[PDB]
Design a protein around this ligand. Structure first.
Ligand SMILES: NC(=O)C1=CN([C@@H]2O[C@H](COP(=O)(O)OP(=O)(O)OC[C@H]3O[C@@H](n4cnc5c(N)ncnc54)[C@H](OP(=O)(O)O)[C@@H]3O)[C@@H](O)[C@H]2O)C=CC1
Ligand SMILES: COc1ccccc1/C(C)=C\c1coc2nc(N)nc(N)c12
Length: 186
């Protein structure tokens, strides 16, 4: 148990997913940022924990499952075991978050990252303590069927910069995006 973080990429219309995939074409540098933010731990020997819902797990290409170099945990109210390739399954975010503090995971885990999708985000962002939201603002509209909740600029602060995050507008494949980090500490 290190810090609690959500990471998402979201279109100008708040879209995160379309038919079990992302709503925009592949953005390699965006995937690379995701990978470097979720995989990097400054503590040797540790890994970060990625928590996700079941549709989010299945949205990941099989070659990238489980997400390499991270401990993967899937949320589901139904599955009897973790899905093929996964090793953790929790019935709730509280259950998962509790599971981190021991019996055996808590000397292996550094940062905890919520990587989607909508319901998991809603609950984490609401979760009382110290929270950071890493949001890639995909600076146009895309047809979507899954959405990210509006961020309350009265509870969260927008940070002007953040270590290892590029602060200028980026562009790729003709699509502009901004990496943002928001922080709350209620
Ligand atoms: N742009 C981005 O940053 C991201 C995009 N996506 C996209 O979003 C979509 C998938 O997201 P979404 O449809 O929201 O689905 P989720 O990944 O949130 O999966 C929903 C399911 O997972 C379980 N689940 C979710 N929350 C909990 C919980 N708190 N406790 C127990 N189980 C839970 C369920 O399974 P059960 O029915 O078995 O209980 C529920 O049906 C895809 O299109 C994917 O590509 C996903 C992540 C990031
Ligand atoms: C199809 O989805 C994926 C495909 C490959 C690897 C990971 C993901 C997942 C689960 C999620 C993400 C893929 O790119 C992302 N960018 C940001 N900024 N946040 C995220 N949560 C993801």
């Amino acid at each position: 148990v290190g810090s609690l973080n959500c990471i998402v990429a979201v279109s100008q219309n708040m879209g995160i997913g379309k038919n079990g995939d992302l709503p925009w074409p592949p953005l390699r540098n965006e995937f690379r940022y995701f990978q470097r933010m979720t995989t990097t731990s400054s503590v040797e020997g540790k890994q970060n924990l990625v928590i996700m819902g079941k549709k989010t797990w299945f949205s990941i290409p099989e070659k990238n499952r489980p997400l390499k170099g991270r401990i993967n945990l899937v949320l589901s109210r139904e599955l009897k075991e973790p899905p093929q390739g996964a090793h953790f399954l929790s019935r709730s975010l509280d259950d998962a978050l509790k599971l981190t503090e021991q019996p055996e995971l808590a000397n292996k885990v550094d940062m905890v990252w919520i990587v989607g999708g909508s319901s998991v985000y809603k609950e984490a962002m609401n979760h009382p303590g110290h929270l950071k939201l890493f949001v890639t603002r995909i600076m146009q509209d895309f047809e979507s069927d899954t959405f990210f909740p509006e961020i309350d600029l009265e509870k969260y602060k927008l940070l002007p910069e953040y270590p290892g995050v590029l602060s200028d507008v980026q562009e790729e494949k003709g699509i502009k995006y901004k990496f943002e980090v928001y922080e709350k500490n209620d």
